[PDB]
Amino acid sequence: TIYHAKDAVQATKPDMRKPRLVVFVVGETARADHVSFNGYERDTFPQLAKIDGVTNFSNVTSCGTSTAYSVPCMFSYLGADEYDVDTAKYQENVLDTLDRLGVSILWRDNNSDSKGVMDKLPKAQFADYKSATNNAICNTNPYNECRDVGMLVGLDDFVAANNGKDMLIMLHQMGNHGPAYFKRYDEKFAKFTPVCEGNELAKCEHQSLINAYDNALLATDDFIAQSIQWLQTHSNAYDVSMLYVSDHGESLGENGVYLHGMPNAFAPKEQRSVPAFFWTDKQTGITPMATDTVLTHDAITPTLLKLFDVTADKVKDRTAFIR
Ligand SMILES: [Au+]
């Protein structure tokens, strides 16, 4: 392990102020420009729009264009300019630091896995929610595909067993993962029709592809709202906050390009322009940065440290999502 924050200290402890409870949704394949709040022509986030205290960040660039590359960078101390995907797994990352400091770290995954982020931590702190041995919400669709909202079930049991501690829960979404966007949402989210249902994107009518993509955003809108609603049920005992950032965007036929993973050197902007939301309870004292702050995945690690009142030299001056 190569360390970067051995100096990290927590200024205030959960035995002398309210314990802090944060959900970080790690999104999947969502594009900034298909978000209602960023000026998209469709209301793709109706439920989040009903919730007070949500900040939408209109200028966020992902570290990369793929799950393997972006997800470790999101939790890195190095920043996009110095990040090396090939050695990322051996670097101390922001979750190693918080866990060392006594924050209870939980990773639930309905996507793939943590791409090495949870590897130095006890396996008991990672849970696979792609399988029904954990996820109670899979038989709601003709594919029996397990749903992101299933990662919320039983979180009260996790809180109860971590009584009075700081807690950071990562929820790694299936989200808008392609090519089969149509599979990614239940029927209640099939607002935009007709929809593409083949693995040959490009052979699909372009509008029908967009329609399946947008329906999957409505399922994500629903999941993020439910996440905040779950947090609100603990807001008296805990200072609760919710951070959402997508790992990367998606090409939807622009210049003949589909899916993602284009190398950064020639990747279209659609693959790196991602949405980000921050919600917090009024009690927490946490203040969002300006909506239009130029932001990147580099802001995640300082944001997670500030949420728990932790300082570390390597990111002392680094712009975050919050003050
Ligand atoms: Au991804």
List the SSEs and their pairings.
Layout: E1 9-10, E2 20-27, H1 46-49, E3 54-57, E4 60-61, H2 67-74, H3 94-100, E5 104-109, E6 126-128, H4 155-161, E7 167-172, H5 206-232, E8 239-246, E9 251-252, E10 258-259, E11 276-280, E12 295-296, H6 300-307, E13 310-311
Parallel strand pairs: 2-7, 2-8, 4-12, 5-6, 5-7
Antiparallel strand pairs: 1-13, 3-11, 8-11, 9-10
Bound molecules: gold ion.
Membrane topology: Multi-pass membrane protein
Enzyme class: transferase
Disulfide bonds: 63-73, 138-146, 196-204
What does this structure look like?
By secondary structure, the protein is of the alpha/beta class. The chain has a single domain, classed as Alkaline Phosphatase, subunit A, CATH 3.40.720.10. The protein contains six helices and 13 strands. The strands form four sheets. It has a seven-stranded mixed beta sheet with strand order 3-11-8-2-7-5-6, with helices on both faces. Strands 1-13 form a two-stranded antiparallel ribbon. Strand 9 and strand 10 form a beta hairpin. The protein starts with 8 loop residues before the first strand and ends in a 12-residue tail after the last strand. The protein binds gold ion. Gold ion (AU) binds next to loops. It catalyses: lipid A (E. coli) + a 1,2-diacyl-sn-glycero-3-phosphoethanolamine + H(+) = lipid A 4'-(2-aminoethyl diphosphate) (E. coli) + a 1,2-diacyl-sn-glycerol. It comes from Escherichia coli. Monomer.
